C-alpha cells in the first residue's frame, strides 16, 4: 500500500525528517517514490517544515496513506484545507 | 606496436609475488619455535646471529630473526612473527616480535623501546 | 600509393621548411587545398598556388621564415615550428565541441574538419561544432 511518512535523515541526537512517498513494504531509510517534504522537530530554523501541497494532494488522489504524524504535518501545512 | 596490434593483443598488467607468505594476508602470525640456533652471515660480513625455526598457525615452517641483544627463546617457546628480512642471512624472511608471548623485551635497553618491546624505566 | 596523403602534405612541408626551401610541390586535392587555405590565412605560409607538373596537378606551398640570425648558426627561426597529424587512418580521432584542444596556450592552431567545413580551433568553438581532429600546428 503506497504510503506517505517520515524517514530519518538527521544524525544521532539530531533528528531530521524527510517526508516521503513510498511502499510501506520498503524499509524506512531506503528507496522512496518521491520526497515531498522535510521536518525538523527541534525547530532550529525559521523553516522547520515544508510540503509542496499540490504534490501531496496528487499522492492522496491516488491513495497513499499518511501515518498520523505525517498527516499531522500535512494538515499543518494545509493539504487538507477546503474552503 | 601498431594500434591495430593493441586492439588485437593489448598491454599486459604486471603481476607481483608476495615477499611474505605469512599466508592469510595476516600482518603477523603466531608460531612455535623448533630450533633456536646461531647462524653464519653472508659473505660481506661476520657475526653470530640468533634465528629460530618456527611452525606457524598457517601450517608454514620458517626461520625468523631474533632482534635485540639478549633472548630467552628456547625450543618450545611460542612466538609472534613480524615480517621483513635480514639482508645478509640466507633464507630468513620474517622477524620475531619482542615483548609478545614468550619473547621477552630487551632488558636494560633505554633507547628505542617501541621496537624491542621493553617498557619505560622509572626515574626519581 | 600514399597511404595518408594529408600526412604526406604536412610532412612534405616539414622537410621543406627544415632545409629552408622557398617552395614545395604537393600533389593536389580539394581537401589539401582547404588545409592550406587555413595555414595561409593563419600566417604559417606565404600562401600556395596550383600548378601542373607533367600534366598532373600539384600545389606549390610557399614557405615562410624568420630573419637571419646572430652568431654561429645564422639560419632563421621557423614560422612553422611544429606540424603534426592527429587523426590518422587506423586510428581516427574526433573531438566534440567541448574536447577541442587549446594548442600551445593558443599561439598554435588545431585544424578540424567539420560538417561546417575545415576550421581552426577558435573558428570551430565560435561556430560551435565538433569534428575530426586533423593537424596540430604551432
Amino acid at each position: 500500500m503506497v504510503k506517505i511518512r517520515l524517514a530519518r535523515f538527521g544524525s544521532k541526537h539530531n533528528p531530521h525528517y524527510r517526508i516521503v512517498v513510498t511502499d510501506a513494504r520498503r524499509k524506512r531509510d531506503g528507496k522512496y517514490i518521491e520526497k515531498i517534504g522535510y521536518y525538523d522537530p527541534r525547530k532550529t530554523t525559521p523553516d522547520w517544515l515544508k510540503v509542496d501541497v499540490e504534490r501531496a494532494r496528487y499522492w492522496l488522489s491516488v491513495g497513499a496513506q499518511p501515518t498520523d504524524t505525517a498527516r499531522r504535518l500535512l494538515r499543518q501545512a494545509g493539504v487538507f484545507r477546503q474552503e | 606496436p601498431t594500434i591495430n596490434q593493441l586492439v588485437r593483443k593489448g598491454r599486459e598488467k604486471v603481476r607481483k609475488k608476495s615477499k611474505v607468505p605469512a599466508l592469510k594476508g595476516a600482518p603477523f602470525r603466531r608460531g612455535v619455535c623448533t630450533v633456536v640456533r646461531t647462524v653464519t652471515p653472508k659473505k660481506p660480513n661476520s657475526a653470530l646471529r640468533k634465528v629460530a625455526k618456527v611452525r606457524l598457525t598457517s601450517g608454514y615452517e620458517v626461520t625468523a630473526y631474533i632482534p635485540g641483544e639478549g633472548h630467552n627463546l628456547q625450543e618450545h617457546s611460542v612466538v609472534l612473527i613480524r615480517g621483513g628480512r635480514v639482508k645478509d642471512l640466507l633464507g630468513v624472511r620474517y622477524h620475531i616480535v619482542r615483548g609478545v608471548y614468550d619473547a621477552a623485551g630487551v632488558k636494560d635497553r633505554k633507547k628505542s623501546r617501541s621496537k624491542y618491546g621493553t617498557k619505560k624505566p622509572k626515574e626519581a | 600509393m600514399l597511404t595518408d596523403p594529408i600526412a604526406d602534405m604536412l610532412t612534405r612541408i616539414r622537410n621543406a621548411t627544415r632545409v629552408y626551401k622557398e617552395s614545395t610541390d604537393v600533389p593536389a586535392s580539394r581537401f589539401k587545398e582547404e588545409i592550406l587555405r587555413i595555414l595561409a590565412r593563419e600566417g604559417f605560409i606565404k600562401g600556395y598556388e596550383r600548378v601542373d607538373v607533367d600534366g598532373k596537378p600539384y600545389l606549390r606551398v610557399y614557405l615562410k621564415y624568420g630573419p637571419r640570425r646572430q652568431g654561429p648558426d645564422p639560419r632563421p627561426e621557423q614560422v612553422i615550428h611544429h606540424i603534426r597529424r592527429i587523426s590518422k587512418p587506423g586510428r581516427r580521432v574526433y573531438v566534440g565541441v567541448k574536447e577541442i584542444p587549446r594548442v600551445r596556450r593558443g599561439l598554435g592552431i588545431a585544424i578540424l574538419s567539420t560538417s561546417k567545413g575545415v576550421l581552426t580551433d577558435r573558428e570551430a568553438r565560435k561556430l560551435g561544432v565538433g569534428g575530426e581532429l586533423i593537424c596540430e600546428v604551432w
Binding site: - | I3, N4, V7, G10 | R91, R92
Partner: protein, 99 residues
C-alpha cells in the same frame, strides 16, 4: 522502441528460421580505433520468405523459441552473396588452427 537491426542471412538450413549476421562498429574504449564486430541472430521466418544472402531488417519480438528473440521485418536488399561468402570462408578457416 522495439530494437531493429539490419543484417545478411547466412543460414537457411533450419525450419522456418534464418540465421542473420549483424555487424556493428564502435570506438575501442582505450585505443580508440573504430573496431567492427558482429553477431548472429536467429530470426523467425514463418513463410520461408527470406533466402541466403538477403539483407534484412530484424525486429525485437515476443520470444519464438529459446535463442529466437527476433523476427524478419523486411527485405532491405536482395542477393549479396559476397557477404555470405565471407562468413562461409571465415568459418571454413576453422579447419586449421588446432592439433
Amino acid at each position: 522502441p522495439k530494437k531493429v537491426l539490419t543484417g545478411v542471412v547466412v543460414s537457411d538450413k533450419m525450419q522456418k528460421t534464418v540465421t542473420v549476421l549483424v555487424e556493428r562498429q564502435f570506438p575501442h574504449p582505450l585505443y580508440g580505433k573504430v573496431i567492427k564486430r558482429s553477431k548472429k541472430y536467429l530470426a523467425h521466418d514463418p513463410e520461408e520468405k527470406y533466402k541466403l544472402g538477403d539483407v534484412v531488417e530484424i525486429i525485437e519480438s515476443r520470444p519464438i523459441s529459446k535463442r529466437k528473440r527476433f523476427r524478419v521485418l523486411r527485405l532491405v536488399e536482395s542477393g549479396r552473396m559476397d557477404l555470405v561468402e565471407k562468413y562461409l570462408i571465415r568459418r571454413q578457416n576453422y579447419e586449421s588452427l588446432s592439433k
